[PDB]
Nucleic acid binder design. Structure first.
Ligand SMILES: OC[C@H]1O[C@@](CO)(O[C@H]2O[C@H](CO)[C@@H](O)[C@H](O)[C@H]2O)[C@@H](O)[C@@H]1O
Ligand SMILES: OC[C@H]1O[C@@](CO)(O[C@H]2O[C@H](CO)[C@@H](O)[C@H](O)[C@H]2O)[C@@H](O)[C@@H]1O
Ligand SMILES: [Mg+2]
Length: 580
DNA sequence: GCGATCAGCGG
DNA sequence: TCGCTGATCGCA
């Protein structure tokens, strides 16, 4: 059954055809400055395996890799591109990426290796990566014979599957989505990850010391108030002190025991002084453990930079995710945690951080897709949307909107943006499910177009089996027909929400591609560093700020044309914290 | 070691 | 609402 192939000791001309399935294997999950364990090439002349030290040192092979006219079909080309970037080798001409193709066809499949993608087309002549490399502490690169056959079989699958995947994408009207959006974006993400973000470790270390001192004081205060020492970070141990020793009331319970979440504690504060201290301890501890220590653990000692990895093929909405470290959830709401951002600095002297974010892109997209007259007019007037929503839902003038009214209207808008259940709205507003649903009803009365869209999209999801975004991204919702209320209701909320969140994702992704092209045309040194859902973070010489103030918002605002304007706010400063 | 649990951060 | 990471704790 074995697959035939040449275990080459040297690179030959037939290995450099102008079209080929290419495998540049990087086994380590985090591919930054990681080893390339083997190479495989499948083209019209046959199948080949090349040892990396051999191929990567060969002038002809390197040139072939960097020749844009020599087309390669791969799986997760960003992984290979970045690993090659760390070795000073440019990878060009990738015309097809099976990972991105499979992702667009059905993000719910969770395709994470060639075998999984291949199974979509009943092709099983390739093993899953885990079966070959194992997992966890037992993970390891096998002997050359085993490794070589695996890489060749993966290349062979890619070679065979390109056609059927492109054919289905075309049928789904997603061919341009792959070739003009995701694949070009993949190269941009590769550049961003490789560039990395400079971190002021001394600053982070000082904050750590400060936090350590405050945690110590609060910790002792907690033991003092509890009358004994215990592991505060143990919900189980904490639950005993709180609901058994101190007798505080049990307002919420978890599947395994007493709930000790912040929202619960907030309500118990009045009963005992220990509660506020536990809340303070949770805050400080979160910062120390997750943001100070967690960040310091992944900073590269030699360059003092963190090189995140953007997972371009994970979410069912089309949004990107970030890991090692996750730079999409750095504190900002609370001033104490916000200061963490002072640690993210420009990578060069006299450079600054420039941040631009879309203002309410999700609600603007909703106004566009639902064609709601009231919502469109609100944005055409660039009104404060939360105040406007309050005015309509509570039937009052602008002057009559109180701070609490706006907060609740903002919470309602949030629930719409993220498609949360009428139950989740109650939890956030600390009100009853009945009252939460009551607000929703009032919202739809004020925004009849949105109500019509919500009803129509659910019916469409049921009829077609999926929902789509502005750029044709798709999400299958099989649960839309379930006779289980909660399961069905969630599917309905995803039907409503995906076109909103997903279209916003499409827009920012296109903006990134457009921005990179403009920066190059303008010969600016400025470059993208991070993307955080609705915002783009760049760094550039201080001499380029004025031009960026005009260029960045314009490019982002014109990425697509909607029935309402797109608005982009921007700031810049010495640190990410200052780009405020 | 590993996965389940619970917790909290952003958009 | 999700995707991420970290501390704890039962099972191995
Ligand atoms: O290279 C990223 C790419 O690889 C996948 C697997 O095909 O994820 C792997 O790498 C990520 C970044 O290190 C890890 O978070 C993940 O656990 C690991 O399996 C894809 O999901 C991703 O698009
Ligand atoms: O000091 C370590 C020792 O204290 C306990 C409580 O008896 O836990 C404390 O310290 C941990 C590490 O800093 C925290 O995670 C925990 O929240 C705090 O109460 C013991 O578990 C530990 O052996
Ligand atoms: Mg914003």
């Amino acid at each position: 059954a074995k697959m035939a192939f040449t275990l080459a000791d040297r690179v030959t001309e037939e290995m450099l055809a102008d079209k080929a399935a290419l495998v540049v294997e990087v086994v380590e999950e985090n591919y930054h400055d990681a080893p390339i364990v083997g190479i495989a090439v499948v083209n019209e002349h046959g199948r080949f395996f090349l040892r990396p030290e051999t191929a990567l040192a060969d002038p002809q092979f390197v040139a072939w890799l960097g020749d844009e006219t020599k087309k390669k079909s791969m799986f997760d080309s960003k992984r290979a591109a970045v690993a090659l970037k760390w070795k000073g080798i440019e990878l060009c001409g990738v015309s097809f990426d099976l990972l991105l193709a499979a992702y667009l066809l059905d993000p719910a499949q969770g395709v994470d290796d060639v075998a999984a993608a291949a199974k979509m087309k009943q092709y099983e002549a390739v093993r899953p990566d885990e079966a070959v490399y194992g997992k966890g502490a037992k993970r390891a690169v096998p002997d050359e014979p085993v490794l070589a056959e695996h890489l060749v079989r993966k290349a062979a699958a890619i070679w065979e599957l390109e056609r059927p995947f492109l054919d289905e994408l075309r049928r789904n009207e997603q061919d341009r989505l792959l070739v003009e959006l995701e694949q070009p974006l993949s190269s941009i993400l590769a550049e961003m990850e490789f560039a990395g973000v400079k971190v002021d470790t001394k600053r982070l270390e000082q904050m750590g010391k400060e936090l350590a001192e405050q945690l110590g004081t609060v910790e002792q205060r907690i033991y003092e108030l509890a009358g004994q020492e215990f592991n505060i970070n143990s919900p189980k141990q904490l639950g005993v002190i709180l609901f058994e020793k101190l007798q505080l009331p049990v307002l919420k319970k978890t599947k395994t025991g007493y709930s000790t979440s912040a929202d619960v504690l907030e309500k118990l504060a009045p009963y005992h002084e220990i509660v506020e201290n536990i809340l303070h301890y949770r805050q400080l501890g979160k910062l120390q453990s997750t943001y100070i220590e967690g960040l310091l653990k992944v900073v590269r000692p030699d360059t003092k930079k963190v090189h995140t990895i953007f997972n371009q093929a994970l979410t069912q909405t089309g949004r990107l995710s970030s890991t090692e470290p996750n730079l999409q959830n750095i504190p900002i709401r609370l001033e104490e945690g916000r200061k963490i951002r002072q640690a993210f600095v420009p990578s060069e002297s006299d450079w600054l951080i420039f941040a631009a974010d879309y203002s309410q892109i999700e609600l603007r997209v909703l106004a566009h897709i639902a064609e709601d007259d009231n919502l469109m007019e609100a944005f055409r007037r660039d009104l404060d949307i939360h105040t406007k929503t309050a005015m309509d839902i509570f039937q009052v003038s602008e002057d009559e909107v109180t701070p609490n009214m706006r907060r609740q209207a903002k919470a309602v808008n949030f629930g719409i943006v993220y498609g949360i259940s009428d139950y989740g709205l109650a939890q956030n507003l600390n009100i009853s499910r009945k009252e939460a649903a009551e607000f929703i009803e009032r919202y739809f009365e004020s925004f009849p177009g949105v109500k019509r869209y919500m009803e129509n999209i659910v019916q469409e999801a049921k009829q077609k089996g999926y929902v789509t975004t502005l750029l044709h991204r798709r999400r299958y919702l099989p649960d839309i027909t379930s006779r289980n209320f909660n399961v069905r209701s969630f599917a309905e909320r995803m039907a409503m929400n995906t076109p909103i969140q997903g279209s916003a994702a499409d827009i920012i992704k296109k903006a990134m591609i457009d921005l990179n092209a403009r920066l190059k045309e303008e010969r600016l040194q400025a470059h993208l560093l991070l993307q955080v859902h609705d915002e783009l973070i760049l760094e550039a010489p201080k001499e380029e700020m004025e031009r960026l103030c005009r260029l960045v918002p314009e490019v982002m605002e014109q990425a697509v044309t909607l029935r309402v304007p797109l608005k982009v706010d921007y700031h810049y400063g010495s640190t990410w914290y200052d780009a405020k």
